[PDB]
Write a protein that binds this ligand. Structure first.
Ligand SMILES: CC(=O)N[C@H]1[C@H]([C@H](O)[C@H](O)CO)O[C@@](O)(C(=O)O)C[C@@H]1O
Ligand SMILES: *[C@@H]1O[C@H](CO)[C@@H](O)[C@H](O)[C@H]1NC(C)=O
Ligand SMILES: *[C@@H]1O[C@H](CO)[C@@H](O)[C@H](O)[C@H]1NC(C)=O
Lengths: 172, 319
């Protein structure tokens, strides 16, 4: 992907994460947990279902067309009919082939992008209280119990509360 | 400082391979197939109107061959024409066969209108052993076989039908080809015969065609069938010195022709679908199909590929 998160600095996905596309995994003094992130999940899903909807409905409402099957050759007029139908099928096959390749390259970049937005969002909440470890993980330089963790996950973490503690841990 | 928080994404054990611009095989968590490759083994009678020709193809249905009375008055979106249809009448050909079959199929109904043609002194309603109706000699019930009077008299014929109705008319008429000059003379007196049909805007003339021909249904004789479309305000004139297979009237044309024909053996069933292929109906939401190029109605687009997977999820990287 263009952003290098999925199959990049996140080395793999989590099979244990079964209730969202993206989420958080932590370790603090009282244990470990895995929780889904709803916003990032929903953003990815919305952009993909949108793709699907535009796609699945075409309108190809055709009735009287031309003959496409022949028992014996007749020459000029029949050649032209076969050539017209064969030309049409190749162009539509090309269109289908290109369409799916474009859509898939985009889908993969969107999902890598959303992973990156999620990581960047948490990086911004954490301010000077944490350091990027390089594998999609932050080392948090202050005590962070289950309520603290959940405040990071739900967007209410207030970096000022723990800054003095974290600054002192980071540089001495 | 020592607690750790990690941002991640889901994965499953075994994902689906897709193609991108770059790669022929990328594994993603989910995908959706965009090519329909399954069909129903039946044709759906709803919501499009299907009419089954059964033993008649559409040309025989129009001519009124034995076995085709069930098609009288019939209206269709799609005429279903069976590969195993069979001629039940006098051996015949249509010089522009596919063009007439197209016009009938497109038109979309068999709405026949009887007219009376006051043919002079010639004997009407000729029948044949090659066109049995319930073991009785008969003919195309939409055509009228004319022959000489009992006292040898096939005079020049000259009748006109004027169109002052609010719809175009389709007249189907024909020309009989004896296999000897002896046959010619005992049927139509004169030799050669000849038909010429005309409108304000056109003109046709057929010279009958005498010669030995292979036996079809026990006969060497033939009928060549033609047609004439007569718009409102125009007229049709029939001229004969012999050999005319005359019309009993005309078919109505719709102003707007929106129907078509599908040649298939597939049985009509009980399902619902608006997409019909010659391999049967399609019941799908997919945008493409590889089942048949022959497809009628509201169909996915036909393509050569057997499969095209659309990714509906991210790269799958398990563990
Ligand atoms: C007189 C007439 O119009 N119809 C007769 C035909 C035709 O004269 C020939 O088929 C023309 O080639 O000949 C028959 O033997 C037949 O085929 O059933 C008897 C039939 O009554
Ligand atoms: C019959 O032909 C005559 C002349 O040959 C012509 O005046 C007349 O209009 C024709 N009648 C019909 C009904 O076409
Ligand atoms: C359509 O695709 C399937 C696989 O998706 C394949 O097995 C089948 O042969 C294809 N049909 C035709 C007519 O090519």
């Amino acid at each position: 992907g263009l952003f290098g998160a999925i199959a990049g600095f996140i080395e793999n996905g989590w099979q244990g994460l079964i209730d969202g596309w993206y989420g958080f995994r932590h370790q603090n003094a009282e244990g470990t947990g895995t929780a889904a992130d709803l916003k990032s999940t929903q953003a990815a899903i919305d952009q993909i279902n949108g793709k699907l909807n535009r796609l699945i409905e075409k309108t190809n409402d055709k009735y009287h067309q031309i003959e496409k099957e022949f028992e014996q050759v007749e020459g000029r007029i029949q050649d032209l009919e076969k050539y017209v139908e064969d030309t049409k099928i190749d162009l539509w096959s090309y269109n289908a082939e290109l369409l799916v390749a474009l859509e898939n390259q985009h889908t993969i970049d969107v999902t890598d992008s959303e992973m990156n937005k999620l990581f960047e969002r948490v990086r911004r909440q954490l301010r000077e209280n944490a350091e990027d470890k390089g594998n999609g993980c932050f080392e948090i330089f202050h005590k962070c119990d289950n309520n603290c963790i959940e405040s990071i996950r739900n967007g209410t973490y207030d970096h000022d509360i723990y800054r003095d503690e974290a600054i002192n841990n980071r540089f001495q | 400082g020592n607690p750790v928080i990690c941002m991640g994404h889901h994965a499953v054990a075994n994902g689906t391979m897709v193609k991108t611009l770059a790669d022929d095989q990328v594994e993603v968590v989910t995908a959706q197939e965009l090519v329909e490759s399954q069909n129903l083994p039946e044709l759906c009678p709803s919501p499009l109107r299907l009419v089954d020709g059964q033993t008649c193809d559409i040309i025989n249905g129009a001519l009124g061959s034995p076995g085709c009375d069930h098609l009288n008055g019939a209206e269709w979106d799609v005429f279903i024409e069976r590969p195993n249809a069979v001629d039940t009448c006098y051996p015949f050909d249509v010089p522009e066969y596919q063009s007439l079959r197209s016009i009938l199929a497109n038109n979309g109904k068999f709405e026949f209108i009887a007219e009376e043609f006051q043919w002079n002194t010639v004997k009407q309603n000729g029948k044949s052993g090659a066109c049995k109706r319930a073991n009785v000699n008969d003919f195309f019930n939409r055509l009228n076989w004319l022959v000489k009077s009992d006292g040898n008299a096939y005079p020049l014929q000259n009748l006109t039908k004027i169109n002052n109705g609010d719809y175009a008319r389709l007249y189907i008429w024909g020309v009989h080809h004896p296999s000897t000059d002896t046959e010619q003379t005992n049927l139509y007196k004169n030799n050669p015969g000849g038909v010429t049909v005309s409108t304000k805007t056109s003109q046709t003339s057929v010279v009958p065609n005498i010669g030995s021909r292979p036996l079809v249904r026990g006969l060497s004789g033939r009928v060549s069938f033609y047609w004439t479309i007569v718009e409102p305000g125009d007229l049709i004139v029939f001229n004969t010195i012999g050999n005319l297979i005359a019309p009993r009237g005309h078919y109505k044309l719709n102003n707007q022709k929106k129907s078509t024909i599908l040649n298939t053996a597939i049985p009509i069933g009980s399902c619902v679908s608006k997409c019909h292929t010659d391999k049967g109906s399609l019941s799908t939401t997919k945008p493409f199909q590889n089942i048949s190029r022959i497809a009628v109605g509201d169909c996915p687009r036909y393509v050569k590929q057997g499969s095209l997977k659309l990714a509906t999820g991210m790269r799958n990287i398990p563990e």
